[PDB]
Each structure stands twice: as structure tokens, then as C-alpha cells.
Amino acid sequence: VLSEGEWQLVLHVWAKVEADVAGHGQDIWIRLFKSHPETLEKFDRFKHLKTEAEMKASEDLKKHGVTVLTALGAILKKKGHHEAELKPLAQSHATKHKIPIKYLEFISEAIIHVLHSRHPGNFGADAQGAMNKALELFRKDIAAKYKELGYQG
Amino acid sequence: VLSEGEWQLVLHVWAKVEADVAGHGQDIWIRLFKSHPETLEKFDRFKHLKTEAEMKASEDLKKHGVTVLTALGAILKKKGHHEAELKPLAQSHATKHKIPIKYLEFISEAIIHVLHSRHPGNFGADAQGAMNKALELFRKDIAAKYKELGYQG
Amino acid sequence: VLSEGEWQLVLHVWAKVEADVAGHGQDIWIRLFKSHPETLEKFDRFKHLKTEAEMKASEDLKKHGVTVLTALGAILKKKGHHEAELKPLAQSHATKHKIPIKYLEFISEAIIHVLHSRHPGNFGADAQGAMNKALELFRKDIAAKYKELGYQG
Amino acid sequence: VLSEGEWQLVLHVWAKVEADVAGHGQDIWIRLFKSHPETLEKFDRFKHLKTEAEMKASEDLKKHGVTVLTALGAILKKKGHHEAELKPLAQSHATKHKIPIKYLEFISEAIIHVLHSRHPGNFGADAQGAMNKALELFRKDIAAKYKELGYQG
Amino acid sequence: VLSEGEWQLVLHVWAKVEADVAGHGQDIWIRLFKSHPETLEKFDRFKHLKTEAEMKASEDLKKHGVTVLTALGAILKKKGHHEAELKPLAQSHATKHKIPIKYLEFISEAIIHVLHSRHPGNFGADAQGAMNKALELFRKDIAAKYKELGYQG
Amino acid sequence: VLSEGEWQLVLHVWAKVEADVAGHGQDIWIRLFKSHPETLEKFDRFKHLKTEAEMKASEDLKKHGVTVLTALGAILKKKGHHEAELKPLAQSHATKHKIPIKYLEFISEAIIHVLHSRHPGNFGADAQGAMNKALELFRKDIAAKYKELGYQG
Ligand code: HEM
Ligand code: HEM
Ligand code: HEM
Ligand code: HEM
Ligand code: HEM
Numbered sequence: 021v022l023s024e025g026e027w028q029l030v031l032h033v034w035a036k037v038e039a040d041v042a043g044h045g046q047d048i049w050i051r052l053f054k055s056h057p058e059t060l061e062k063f064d065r066f067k068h069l070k071t072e073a074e075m076k077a078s079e080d081l082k083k084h085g086v087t088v089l090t091a092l093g094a095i096l097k098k099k100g101h102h103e104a105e106l107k108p109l110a111q112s113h114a115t116k117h118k119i120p121i122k123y124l125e126f127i128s129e130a131i132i133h134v135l136h137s138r139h140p141g142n143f144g145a146d147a148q149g150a151m152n153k154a155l156e157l158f159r160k161d162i163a164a165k166y167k168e169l170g171y172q173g
Numbered sequence: 174v175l176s177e178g179e180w181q182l183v184l185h186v187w188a189k190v191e192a193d194v195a196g197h198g199q200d201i202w203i204r205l206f207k208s209h210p211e212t213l214e215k216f217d218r219f220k221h222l223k224t225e226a227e228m229k230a231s232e233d234l235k236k237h238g239v240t241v242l243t244a245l246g247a248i249l250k251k252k253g254h255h256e257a258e259l260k261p262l263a264q265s266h267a268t269k270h271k272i273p274i275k276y277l278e279f280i281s282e283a284i285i286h287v288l289h290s291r292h293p294g295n296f297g298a299d300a301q302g303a304m305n306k307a308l309e310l311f312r313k314d315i316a317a318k319y320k321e322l323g324y325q326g
Numbered sequence: 327v328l329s330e331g332e333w334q335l336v337l338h339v340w341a342k343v344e345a346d347v348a349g350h351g352q353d354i355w356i357r358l359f360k361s362h363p364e365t366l367e368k369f370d371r372f373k374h375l376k377t378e379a380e381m382k383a384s385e386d387l388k389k390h391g392v393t394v395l396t397a398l399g400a401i402l403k404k405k406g407h408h409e410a411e412l413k414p415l416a417q418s419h420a421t422k423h424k425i426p427i428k429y430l431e432f433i434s435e436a437i438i439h440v441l442h443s444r445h446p447g448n449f450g451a452d453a454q455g456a457m458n459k460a461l462e463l464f465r466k467d468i469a470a471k472y473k474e475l476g477y478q479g
Numbered sequence: 480v481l482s483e484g485e486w487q488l489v490l491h492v493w494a495k496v497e498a499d500v501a502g503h504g505q506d507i508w509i510r511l512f513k514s515h516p517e518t519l520e521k522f523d524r525f526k527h528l529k530t531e532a533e534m535k536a537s538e539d540l541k542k543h544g545v546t547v548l549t550a551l552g553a554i555l556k557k558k559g560h561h562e563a564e565l566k567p568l569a570q571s572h573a574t575k576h577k578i579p580i581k582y583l584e585f586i587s588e589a590i591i592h593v594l595h596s597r598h599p600g601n602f603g604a605d606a607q608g609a610m611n612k613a614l615e616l617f618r619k620d621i622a623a624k625y626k627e628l629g630y631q632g
Numbered sequence: 633v634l635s636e637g638e639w640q641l642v643l644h645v646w647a648k649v650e651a652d653v654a655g656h657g658q659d660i661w662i663r664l665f666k667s668h669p670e671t672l673e674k675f676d677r678f679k680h681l682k683t684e685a686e687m688k689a690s691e692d693l694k695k696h697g698v699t700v701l702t703a704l705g706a707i708l709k710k711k712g713h714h715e716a717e718l719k720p721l722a723q724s725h726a727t728k729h730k731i732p733i734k735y736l737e738f739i740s741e742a743i744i745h746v747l748h749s750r751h752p753g754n755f756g757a758d759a760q761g762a763m764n765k766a767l768e769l770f771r772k773d774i775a776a777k778y779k780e781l782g783y784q785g
Numbered sequence: 786v787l788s789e790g791e792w793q794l795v796l797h798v799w800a801k802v803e804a805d806v807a808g809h810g811q812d813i814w815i816r817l818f819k820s821h822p823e824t825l826e827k828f829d830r831f832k833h834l835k836t837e838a839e840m841k842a843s844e845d846l847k848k849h850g851v852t853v854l855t856a857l858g859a860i861l862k863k864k865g866h867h868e869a870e871l872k873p874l875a876q877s878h879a880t881k882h883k884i885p886i887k888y889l890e891f892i893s894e895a896i897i898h899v900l901h902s903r904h905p906g907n908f909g910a911d912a913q914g915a916m917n918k919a920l921e922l923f924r925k926d927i928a929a930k931y932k933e934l935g936y937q938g
């Protein structure tokens with residue numbers, strides 16, 4: 021459980037992200053696919069992208085990034101009371117996309133790296149500590165649902 | 174032990190399956206053999222089938238699917254009081270067919286995937302949770318019999 | 327410890343076996359050597375047999391099967407009070423033949439398969455459960471003697 | 480927790496190091512890169528250096544050594560009350576440089592070897608014991624931050 | 633600890649062995665070297681022997697067998713009170729010959745096999761049980777000394 | 786902790802060693818390097834020695850053996866109260882020579898073998914037991930210092 025103080029550090033940096041959700045989505049994507057190329061194989065819609073240039077130019081990948089960050093933002097804004105938001109996401113990612121927990125760890129790593137680069141003034145050690153805690157909370161509850169749905173993860 | 178509420182979610186989606194048992198049987202089969210080809214080797218009657226086309230055309234495989242789902246349906250409708258129904262099934266599958274528990278897990282996975290595809294309105298996160306729980310109950314009791322009969326599983 | 331009820335299920339099917347001990351001995355043998363060929367290597371008297379045809383024709387192998395089943399029958403009829411019968415068998419099999427417990431498991435598996443094939447009316451799930459329990463009792467006590475005699479098994 | 484006596488042994492030898500921070504920085508560097516060449520790969524600014532001669536001649540590597548030892552000195556002088564000093568160092572080394580704990584162990588080993596060579600009169604068994612304890616304290620608290628920041632280390 | 637009854641079974645069969653110590657020594661030797669050829673490598677005095685024929689003909693190997701069995705007999709006759717007899721044997725075998733416990737297990741196995749072959753009337757299941765227990769007692773106390781002397785065994 | 790009786794057995798045989806420290810040093814050396822050639826690699830001053838003949842002829846290796854045994858003798862004569870003597874030895878062997886505990890075990894083995902060969906009348910089972918205990922005490926306390934100094938060993 022996160023403290024109100026920790027939630028504030030998270031929502032304060034997220035308000036900066038919201039100033040340009042599409043741009044933030046792109047940076048996270050490229051970071052993820054360059055650091056862990058195997059994840060790209062899960063996207064039959066984007067697996068043909070070869071270079072960073074191609075990724076940056078994909079209008080579809082950009083739109084998907086916005087969809088992703090918007091869903092995550094709705095979750096964070098619930099400050100732990102995200103049961104309703106997690107159910108449909110756990111179902112699709114476990115049953116249709118088949119995304120293991122290890123990959124959620126990788127994208128969490130990408131989110132932190134991008135926030136650290138673009139928002140150093142609002143992403144100091146304590147702020148990163150809180151964001152990490154929030155994402156670990158997310159993964160802990162998703163992995164829980166995964167088990168209930170019958171997917172090891 | 175499942176709650177009455179959980180059983181209801183299971184029987185509600187199963188009533189949809191019963192509207193076309195043969196068609197549901199076929200989809201589960203193809204899904205199983207494509208996802209885990211090694212299972213096909215256990216069926217000396219169907220191991221010669223090479224493609225999805227051939228499987229879809231096999232009148233015998235279709236009939237067997239109905240026999241399978243009918244037996245499973247009788248079990249689910251007992252809501253946990255399935256001792257009598259499990260004995261003969263555990264004996265044949267342990268002693269004659271020699272089907273390991275790992276393969277029952279694979280077919281459970283196939284059942285969930287097919288229900289999720291054909292009945293999204295009646296197979297939400299909670300419904301899938303209940304169905305998974307019912308199938309895990311099935312496997313837990315079968316594995317138990319397996320041990321009693323002298324088969325590791 | 328087996329219940330009187332369990333012993334009855336065992337002795338009831340064994341009375342059928344006794345109607346043709348020699349034939350039952352042969353079926354068990356062929357089943358064992360085909361399923362686990364390595365066991366044949368322990369019999370310097372039968373290791374030259376190449377096919378199922380040759381095995382079925384061996385008058386010596388047939389006679390040995392009768393000797394084996396007769397010894398086992400005497401044990402089962404003691405309903406757990408088989409200490410005297412086990413000593414000489416554990417000594418020869420541990421010290422002279424050098425038969426590991428793993429091989430006693432294999433022949434137990436062969437006995438069950440043959441009874442299941444030839445006597446389905448008297449070898450239902452409960453009956454098989456009892457027979458398995460009786461054979462596991464046998465192996466448990468033999469393995470115990472093995473240790474006392476200085477053979478790991 | 481270190482005793483006041485142990486801290487004194489540490490600060491007494493460190494006062495000698497401060498008489499020539501740049502020279503001490505160089506010796507530690509060369510010792511580290513020769514003993515564990517893989518660490519050099521983390522420095523994109525120095526990874527091109529091939530020999531000890533080149534390292535000794537690099538004006539940039541010399542300047543960096545001073546920056547490093549100065550930061551470490553500030554930490555040691557806090558005698559355990561180094562929370563504020565550790566936060567920014569853990570953030571950069573975990574998130575940007577990605578330096579595993581194993582590498583902090585290697586540089587700790589290099590520091591001890593150099594002090595042992597240049598200051599034997601002030602680096603006896605007890606003194607080395609205290610310095611080791613101080614560096615293990617450093618690593619223990621850094622590894623702790625690493626976890627909070629989301630880096631395994 | 634062995635019972636007086638168990639000791640009697642051991643000494644009763646040993647009195648038969650004493651009727652021909654040299655012959656018993658030879659049988660044990662050949663059995664050991666044929667079953668576990670690696671043990672022969674420890675005897676620089678006998679490692680040149682190639683066949684069973686050569687072993688049976690070696691006058692020196694025969695004499696050594698008598699020396700061995702005589703020492704073992706003196707131990708068994710002490711019925712557990714063999715501390716004085718074990719010290720010099722543990723010292724030479726641990727420090728000079730370097731004989732691991734695994735090899736004492738192998739020769740124990742050879743002793744049992746030979747007694748079983750030559751004295752079936754006095755080496756039934758109970759008798760073998762007692763002899764095994766006596767030899768395990770021997771090995772347990774020797775391994776203990778080994779540790780005290782500084783040899784792992 | 787060793788008893789006064791055990792210390793006496795150790796010091797009694799050591800008084801014999803002192804009658805020819807140089808000769809004893811040489812025998813231990815050759816035994817060590819022949820049994821465990823890898824240890825020679827630690828001595829940059831002696832690693833060029835190829836044969837036993839060369840070792841026996843090295844005046845420097847002979848002198849070093851005396852230095853070694855003299856230091857060990859001073860330790861043993863302290864009968865457990867060797868804290869002051871161990872500190873400088875642990876520092877050099879951990880930090881400069883980098884000698885793992887495994888190698889101290891090897892030289893302990895060499896010491897015992899040589900005493901057993903040259904002094905059988907004063908190195909019986911009990912005497913060897915005491916000497917082993919004294920050397921294990923030595924290694925236990927050295928390994929302890931190693932940890933304090935920051936060397937795993
Ligand atoms: C921060 C974590 C994540 C969030 C909040 C998230 C969110 C979403 C959302 C809202 C959708 C659209 C609706 C749906 O299908 O449920 C989606 C689709 C998808 N997600 Fe995720 N996702 C996350 C991580 C991942 C990761 C790490 C992978 C793969 C390595 C993944 C693979 C997919 C795929 C394959 C789709 C379908 C895309 C398409 O074909 O249109 N997701 N995700
Ligand atoms: C949902 C789980 C399952 C149910 C309810 C089920 C049910 C049945 C039923 C009722 C029969 C006919 C009667 C009998 O032989 O007992 C049967 C036959 C058989 N089952 Fe299953 N089964 C299940 C899973 C499997 C799996 C996963 C395998 C193999 C990977 C398997 C292999 C067989 C075989 C080989 C036969 C014989 C088919 C033939 O040759 O005619 N079963 N099963
Ligand atoms: C149900 C378990 C078994 C029973 C009741 C049994 C019984 C017997 C009996 C009564 C004999 C003759 C007397 C004797 O030597 O003790 C015998 C001989 C023998 N048994 Fe078994 N046995 C069993 C399992 C096995 C197994 C699994 C193996 C090998 C894989 C084995 C290998 C032998 C051998 C090699 C002989 C000697 C045959 C010859 O050369 O004449 N037995 N057994
Ligand atoms: C005694 C432990 C260490 C201390 C006190 C220390 C201190 C520092 C300081 C103060 C900086 C500059 C500011 C910053 O980036 O945070 C720095 C930069 C850096 N450190 Fe460390 N560091 C330590 C160990 C290491 C080790 C062992 C590695 C790698 C094996 C490492 C890799 C780096 C890198 C790559 C930089 C950036 C250099 C550049 O490109 O300019 N550090 N470190
Ligand atoms: C029942 C167990 C054993 C007993 C009672 C025993 C007894 C003896 C005795 C009394 C001696 C002569 C005096 C001495 O050196 O201590 C001896 C010598 C020896 N033993 Fe054993 N021993 C046993 C097992 C073994 C085993 C299993 C090995 C090797 C695999 C072994 C290897 C040797 C060697 C190499 C010698 C020296 C022979 C020579 O070169 O003359 N012993 N043993």
C-alpha cells in the first residue's frame with residue numbers, strides 16, 4: 021500500500037506526461053523494442069518494423085501508445101482502488117495477447133527510463149521510488165488476476 | 174470448493190455451448206492440436222490428420238468431440254458432486270490412454286480460449302475466473318484418482 | 327494397511343486369474359518386456375528372446391510365469407501377514423538377481439494392465455484401487471527388507 | 480553499525496589519501512580495469528583505452544577519479560549518516576549507468592589493494608578491517624536504494 | 633548397536649569362514665576386482681594383474697587376503713568394543729592408502745555375496761541382516777575416525 | 786578448543802620437527818607441489834621449478850620453508866592464544882598473495898603426511914587427531930580474519 025505522499029509524487033510527474041501523451045508513448049515504445057526486441061514479436065501489427073526510424077514514423081504505433089498510456093493513467097489516478105480497471109486488461113493480456121509478467125516488468129523499466137530523461141526536476145530519487153512502487157503494485161495485482169484466469173504469467 | 178454464484182457463471186455459459194455441441198467440439202480440437210501437436214499422438218484414430226482442413230472434415234473427430242463435451246457437461250452440472258462420473262474416466266485415461274495431467278491442462282486452456290472467442294458477452298473476467306476454478310477442481314480430483322489407481326500422471 | 331473390503335476386491339479378481347495362471351503369466355511377461363525391454367537383460371535365461379512370437383513359444387518362460395504368480399498369490403492371500411514369505415524373496419532378488427525397486431514397479435504396472443484387459447467386469451476403479459494398494463504394500467515391505475540386507479534397491 | 484574507533488581508523492588513512500587525491504584515483508582505476516576489464520565497458524568515454532600507459536596519460540580519466548574519490552570521501556566523513564549523499568548516486572548508477580552491485584564490490588577491492596600498497600603503516604589488519612566494514616556498509620545501503628528505485632543490481 | 637542375538641548370527645557364519653580363511657580371501661578379492669576394477673588401482677602391488685586366472689594364481693594376493701580377513705575377524709569378535717583395533721587401521725587407510733568409504737562399501741558387498749554363495753544354510757535373510765548391520769557399524773566408526781584424522785573419506 | 790592433553794601431543798611431535806626445520810620444510814614443499822601443482826603458480830619466485838630435483842636443489846625454496854615452519858611453530862606454541870600472530874599473516878595472504886582456504890587445507894594435508902612418514906613413533910592415531918584439530922583451529926580462525934578483511938577465501 022502506497023502513502024498519500026507517495027501517490028502525490030506519482031501524480032505530479034504524470035501531470036507532466038499528460039502535456040504530451042503521444043510523444044511520451046513513442047519514446048517508451050522505441051525504448052522497449054530496442055532494449056527487449058523479443059517483445060515486438062507479440063505485436064503482429066508492428067512486428068514488421070525494422071528500425072527506430074520506422075517506429076517513429078508509424079502513425080498506428082503512435083496511436084496505440086496513446087491508448088496504452090491513457091489506460092495506465094486511469095489506473096494510477098485511482099490510487100490503488102483499480103479493481104474494475106484491471107479486470108478487462110488482465111483478461112485480454114492473459115487470454116488473447118498472452119503477455120507474461122516478465123514483459124510488464126520490461127515496459128515498467130522503459131517508463132521509468134523515459135520519465136528520468138524527460139523530467140529530471142520532477143523525477144528525483146524519492147519520486148522514482150514512488151513510481152516504482154506504484155508499478156510494482158500494478159504488476160502484483162495483475163499477476164494475481166492472471167492466476168485466477170488460469171494463466172501462469 | 175466453488176460458490177453457488179461461481180457455479181451459476183459456469184452453467185450460464187455452458188448453456189450457450191449446448192446450443193451447438195458439435196461445433197464447439199471441433200473448435201476445441203483444432204485449437205488443441207495446433208497449440209500442442211504432441212497430444213494428437215495419443216489418438217491412434219486421428220494421428221494421421223495432417224492439416225486443420227482435414228480435422229474440420231473428419232466426421233469421426235466431430236463425433237468424438239460431442240462425446241467428450243457431453244461427459245464434461247454431465248460433470249459440471251453435478252456442481253462438485255462428481256465422484257461417480259470421475260471414476261470410469263480416470264480409469265480409462267490413466268490405464269488405457271495414459272493421459273498425463275499436463276495434457277488435461279492443455280485441453281482446459283483450449284476450452285477457455287474457445288469460450289472467450291465465441292461468447293465474450295457471457296465470458297467476462299469473473300465468468301472466466303469461475304470456469305477456470307471449475308476445471309482446476311476437475312483436474313485436482315482426477316489427479317487424485319490417478320494416484321489411487323497407480324498412475325503418476 | 328488395507329481394509330477387509332479392499333482385500334476382498336483383490337482376492338475376488340485373483341480367483342479369476344487362478345483359472346489360468348499360465349496364460350496370465352505369459353501376458354504379463356510379454357507386456358513387461360515390450361514396455362520395458364531393459365528388464366529382460368536381468369534374465370540370462372531369457373535375454374536371447376527377440377520377438378513376442380518367441381516369448382509366447384518359450385516353454386521355460388511359461389513355466390517361470392507360473393512360479394512367479396504362485397509366489398505372489400501366496401503373498402496376497404496372507405492379507406498383509408506376509409513376513410515369512412517375503413524374507414526369502416527379498417534375499418534372492420537383492421543379493422543374487424539384483425532387482426531394483428523400479429523394476430518391481432514396472433511389473434506391478436504390467437499386472438494391472440493385464441487384469442484390466444482380461445477382467446473388466448471385476449476390475450473397475452475401486453477394484454484397481456485396491457490391487458494397486460496391495461502391490462504398493464508389497465513393494466514397501468520389500469524395499470524395507472532390501473535396506474536391512476544391505477541393498478539400496 | 481561501525482564504532483567510533485573503527486571510523487577513526489578509516490578517517491585516519493583517508494587523510495593520507497587526501498594528500499594526493501588525483502594520484503590515488505589513477506592507481507585505483509588502473510587496478511580496477513586490469514583486474515576486471517569488463518568494468519571498462521561501462522564507460523563509453525574511456526572504453527577505447529587499450530593499455531595501462533594510455534590510462535595513465537588520460538587527463539579525463541584522472542579528473543574523473545578525483546570526482547569519484549571526492550564523492551566517496553564526503554560519504555565516509557558522514558560516519559553512517561549518509562542518506563542524503565546516497566540518493567543521487569544510487570539514482571544515476573542504477574538508472575543511467577546501470578552498475579550492478581558486483582562492480583561496486585570490485586572497486587571496493589581495488590581501493591583496499593591501493594591503500595595497502597601506498598600506506599602500510601596506516602593500513603594494518605585492524606585498519607583494513609574497519610575500511611572493509613565501511614565499504615560494506617556503503618554497498619549495503621546502496622543495494623537497498625537500488626531495490627527501491629526498481630533495479631535488481 | 634547390535635543385539636547379542638545378531639552378534640551370534642554373525643559369529644556363527646564367521647566360524648565357517650575360519651575353516652578356510654585363504655580360500656575365502658581369494659573369492660572376495662576376485663569378486664571385488666571384477667565388480668569394481670577401479671579398486672585394484674589402489675594396490676600398486678597387484679594392479680598389474682590382468683585376469684581372474686592371474687589373481688587366483690598370485691601367492692602374494694592370497695597371503696594378503698588372509699591378513700585382511702584376520703584383522704576383520706578380530707574386530708567382529710569384539711562385538712562392538714573395537715576402538716583399539718580400529719585406530720591403526722583408520723590411520724593407514726586414510727593417510728597412506730587413501731581408501732574412501734565408498735570402497736569399504738564395495739568390499740562389504742563382496743563379503744556378503746561370497747558368504748551367500750558358500751554358506752546358504754547359515755546365511756539366510758536374518759543372518760545376512762545381522763552381517764550387514766555389523767559391517768555398517770564398522771564403516772560408521774571408521775568414517776568417524778577418518779574425520780578426526782583429517783580425511784573426508 | 787583443544788585440551789591440554791591434545792596440545793601436548795602436538796608440541797611433542799613438533800619438538801622432533803625442530804631438530805631439522807629446513808629438511809622438514811623441503812619435504813612438505815615437494816609433497817605439496819607434487820600433489821597439488823596449481824599451488825606452485827601462486828609463487829612467482831618458484832613457479833619456474835619443473836622437477837622434484839630442481840626443488841630439492843633450490844636454496845631459496847629451502848630458506849622459505851624455514852620461514853614458514855617457524856611462523857607456524859610460533860602459532861602452535863601459543864596453544865590457541867594466537868590472535869596477535871594471525872593478524873599480519875591473514876592480511877598478507879588475503880590481500881597480497883590471495884591464498885584461498887582450499888590451499889591452506891592442501892598444505893595442512895602435506896604437513897600431516899610428512900609427520901606420519903618421518904615420525905611414526907610419535908604420530909599415532911591420537912597424535913594425528915590432535916594435530917589435525919590444531920590445524921583446523923588455525924584455518925577456522927584465519928578464514929574468520931579473511932572475512933573481516935574483505936576476502937571470501
Ligand atoms: C503498462 C502496461 C500495459 C498496459 C496499461 C496495456 C494496455 C493495453 C490496452 C488498453 C490495449 C487495448 C485493449 C486491450 O486489448 O486490452 C492493449 C492492447 C495490446 N497490448 Fe497491452 N498494455 C500493457 C503492456 C503490454 C505489453 C508489455 C505487451 C507486450 C510485450 C502488450 C501487448 C498488447 C497487445 C499485443 C495488444 C494488442 C495490440 C493490437 O494488435 O492492436 N501490452 N494493451
Ligand atoms: C476435458 C477432458 C476430457 C474428457 C471429459 C474426456 C472424455 C473422454 C470420453 C468420455 C471418452 C470415451 C470413453 C473413455 O474412453 O473413457 C474419451 C476417450 C479418449 N480420450 Fe479423453 N477426455 C478428456 C481429455 C482427453 C485428453 C486431453 C486426451 C489426450 C491428449 C484424451 C485422450 C483420449 C483418448 C485417446 C480416447 C480414446 C479415443 C478413441 O480411440 O476412440 N482425452 N475421453
Ligand atoms: C511380482 C514380483 C516378483 C515376484 C513375486 C518374483 C518371484 C520370483 C520367484 C518365486 C523366483 C524363483 C525363486 C527365487 O529365485 O527367489 C524368481 C526368480 C527370478 N526373478 Fe523374480 N519375482 C518378481 C519380480 C521380478 C522382476 C521384476 C525381475 C526382473 C526385472 C525378477 C528377476 C528374477 C530373476 C532373474 C529370477 C531368476 C530366474 C532364473 O534364472 O531362473 N523378478 N522370482
Ligand atoms: C566507490 C564507488 C563509486 C562512486 C562513489 C562513484 C561516483 C560517481 C560520481 C560522483 C559520478 C558523477 C555523477 C554521477 O553520474 O552520479 C559517477 C559517474 C559514473 N560512474 Fe560512478 N561511482 C562509483 C563506482 C562506479 C563503478 C564501479 C562504475 C562502473 C564499473 C561506475 C560507473 C560510472 C559511470 C559510467 C559514470 C559516468 C562517467 C561519464 O561518462 O562521465 N561508477 N560515479
Ligand atoms: C574389510 C575392510 C578392510 C580391512 C579389514 C583391511 C585390512 C588391511 C590390513 C590389516 C592391512 C595391512 C596393515 C595396514 O596397512 O593397515 C591392509 C593393507 C592395505 N589395504 Fe586394506 N583393509 C580393508 C579394506 C581395504 C580396501 C577396500 C582397500 C582398497 C580398495 C584397501 C587397501 C589397502 C592397501 C592398498 C593396503 C596395502 C597393501 C600392500 O601394498 O601391501 N583395504 N588392509
Ligand code: HEM
Nearest residue numbers: 824827828830852853856857873874877882884888889892
Ligand atoms: C601453514 C600455512 C602457512 C603459513 C604459516 C605461511 C607463512 C608465510 C610467511 C610467514 C610468509 C612471509 C611473510 C608474509 O608474506 O606474510 C609467507 C609468504 C608467502 N606465502 Fe605463505 N604461509 C602458509 C601457507 C601458504 C600457502 C598454502 C600458499 C600458497 C599455496 C602461500 C603463499 C605465500 C606466498 C606466495 C608468499 C610470498 C613468497 C615470496 O614471494 O617470497 N602460503 N607465508
